[PDB]
Amino acid sequence: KWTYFGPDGENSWSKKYPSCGGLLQSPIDLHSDILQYDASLTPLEFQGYNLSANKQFLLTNNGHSVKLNLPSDMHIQGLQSRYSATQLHLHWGNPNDPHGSEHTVSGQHFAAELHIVHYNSDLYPDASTASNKSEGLAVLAVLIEMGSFNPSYDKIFSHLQHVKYKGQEAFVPGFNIEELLPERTAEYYRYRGSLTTPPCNPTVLWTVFRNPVQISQEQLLALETALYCTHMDDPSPREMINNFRQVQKFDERLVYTSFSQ
Amino acid sequence: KWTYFGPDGENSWSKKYPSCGGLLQSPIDLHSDILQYDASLTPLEFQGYNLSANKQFLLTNNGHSVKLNLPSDMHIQGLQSRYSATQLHLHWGNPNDPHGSEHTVSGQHFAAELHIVHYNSDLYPDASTASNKSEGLAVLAVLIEMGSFNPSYDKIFSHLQHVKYKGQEAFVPGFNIEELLPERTAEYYRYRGSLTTPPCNPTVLWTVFRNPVQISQEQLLALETALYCTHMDDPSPREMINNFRQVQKFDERLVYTSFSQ
Ligand SMILES: NS(=O)(=O)c1cc(C(=O)NCCO)c(S(=O)(=O)c2ccccc2)cc1Cl
Numbered sequence A, B: 001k002w003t004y005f006g007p008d009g010e011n012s013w014s015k016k017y018p019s020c021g022g023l024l025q026s027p028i029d030l031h032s033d034i035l036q037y038d039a040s041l042t043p044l045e046f047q048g049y050n051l052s053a054n055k056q057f058l059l060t061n062n063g064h065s066v067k068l069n070l071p072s073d074m075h076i077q078g079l080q081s082r083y084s085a086t087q088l089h090l091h092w093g094n095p096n097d098p099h100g101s102e103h104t105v106s107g108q109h110f111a112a113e114l115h116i117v118h119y120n121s122d123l124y125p126d127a128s129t130a131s132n133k134s135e136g137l138a139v140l141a142v143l144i145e146m147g148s149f150n151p152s153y154d155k156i157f158s159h160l161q162h163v164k165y166k167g168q169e170a171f172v173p174g175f176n177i178e179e180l181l182p183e184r185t186a187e188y189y190r191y192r193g194s195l196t197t198p199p200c201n202p203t204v205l206w207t208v209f210r211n212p213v214q215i216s217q218e219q220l221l222a223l224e225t226a227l228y229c230t231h232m233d234d235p236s237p238r239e240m241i242n243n244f245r246q247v248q249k250f251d252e253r254l255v256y257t258s259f260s261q
C-alpha cells in the first residue's frame, strides 16, 4: 500500500519504490524562468478518441483515484513513438482547499488535473510493461478550474456515485474523449519526468495543455467529496481527497513550450 | 547522512528518520484558503536579543546550513511559556535560482529564509528534550528578499569565508539579533509543524513574519556560493545550495494570522 497521507504518504514512498526518491520526479512548477519555446513542438493528433456510445468503458475506484479504462485503439500521433491509451484518471484537493492539481503554473495550483495515460505500443504490450522502460509512457495533462458547467466532464462525473468505494466498478458509455481536452491543444508544455504515483519511474513524456478547462463549482464539489479511498468493509474509512503529489524540485532543467508567449 | 539532492535527498529522509514521513510537516505554502485571522494573537517581545559585542558566538558549517549558536538568556515573551534561543541558521537557493525560502506565499519563494530556534525552557532542560514534545520548540522565520545591502546580516555573512567546509567553525562577536527581524513584527503567521530538516519531529510552533527583510545581490551571492555541504577532504565535494525542503501537505491544519487578509 501507499497513500497521500499519514505514515504511508508521499514522503515514505521511496522506502519501497526507490524511483520515488530518484531523479526526474514529477509533478513540477511550470514557471516563466524555466520555459523555453520549441518551434518543433507541433500539434499532437488524437486518433480514435471518438468512442462509440454503443460501447461500455470500465470506471474504477482504485483507492488512489477514479480511473476510466481506455481502449488501445486510442493513440497520440506526433511523438517519436506511437503511444496508445490505457486509462485516464484525476487528481484533486478538498472543499477547504480546492486547489489539487499536480502541476503548478508560476507557483499556482489549478482546482484539479486530468491525466490520460498512454504507453509506447511500438515496443511494449501494455503500460505496466512500458512503465519501467525509457520513454515507456506519455501522459496528457489537462488543468481544471472552476467555471461554467461542463457536459463532457459530466459524462464521467455523473457516474462518481457508482464508484464510492475502493474496488467498485461502473460502466461509462463511450463519448468523444477529445471533448475533455481544453481549447487550443496546440499550446502545451513538454518535459521528461516521472509517474506522479508509485513506482514513480522516470519514464514519462509529459504534455500539459497550456489552457485549463472549466467545470462548475457543483461538479468540482462532487469530484472532491464523492469517493472514499477505502474498501466498504474497512474499519477506518477515509475520504478520497488531496490525492495529488507535492511539486518536485526541478533543477537546471527546462520545460519546453509549443507557444512563445 | 542526509542532503537536499540525490539519493539522500528529501524524498528519502523518511528512510532513516521516521518522522519525516509523518504528519504535521513543515514548511507549508501560505495562502488565503488555509488562513484564519485570530484577534487573540498579540505581538512577541524579543528579550536579550542584543548580544554583547564583547562576547563571542560559535558559527559552524554543520554541512546542512550555517548555524550561529545563541545563548539561553535570549528569549521570546508572549507565548504561553518562556522560549529561550538555541541557534539561528538559514536556507537558500542557488545563483541560477535565488529563491530558496522554505515557506512560500501564494506558491512564491522568497530569496532566502532565516530560522531562529528556541526551546520551551520553562518545561524542558534543553532543545533535544523539547524537540520530542508538542510545542517543545518555537521557531521565528524571517523571509529574505533581494534588496538593499543589510549591515546586520553582514554580521553573519562576513564570516562565511571561515566556515567554508562542513565541521569548520568561527566566532562571531555579539550583535543585535533584533536587527535581523523585519518591520512590524506584530504581523505574523502562526501554525503547528515540524523541524524542516531531519529528524522532522512535528514539535515546532512556527511564527513566520508577514514582512520580509532585504539583503543585497552581493550578500545573497556570497551565501549561495561560500559554503560546501562536505568536509574539506571529501573526495566528491558538494556545494551548499538549495538547502530548503519542498512545502508539505496541510494534514487538516489551519494557519492563524495576527493580521487581516
Ligand atoms: N499520475 S500519472 O503520472 O499520470 C500515472 C498514474 C497512474 C495511476 O493510475 N496510478 C494509480 C493512481 O490512479 C499510472 S498507471 O498506468 O496506473 C501505472 C501504475 C503502476 C505501474 C505502471 C503503470 C500511470 C501514470 Cl503515468
Ligand SMILES: NS(=O)(=O)c1cc(C(=O)NCCO)c(S(=O)(=O)c2ccccc2)cc1Cl
Binding pocket: B062, B064, B065, B067, B086, B087, B089, B115, B116, B117, B127, B128, B131, B137, B139, B194, B195, B196, B197, B198, B199, B204
Ligand atoms: N529548519 S528548522 O525547522 O528551523 C530546525 C533546524 C534545525 C537544524 O539545525 N537542522 C540542521 C540543518 O539546518 C534544528 S536543530 O537545532 O539542529 C535540532 C535537531 C534535533 C533536535 C532538536 C533540535 C531545529 C529546527 Cl526547529
Ligand SMILES: [Zn+2]
Binding pocket: A089, A090, A091, A115, A196
Ligand atoms: Zn495522474
Ligand SMILES: [Zn+2]
Binding pocket: B089, B090, B091, B115, B196
Ligand atoms: Zn531551518
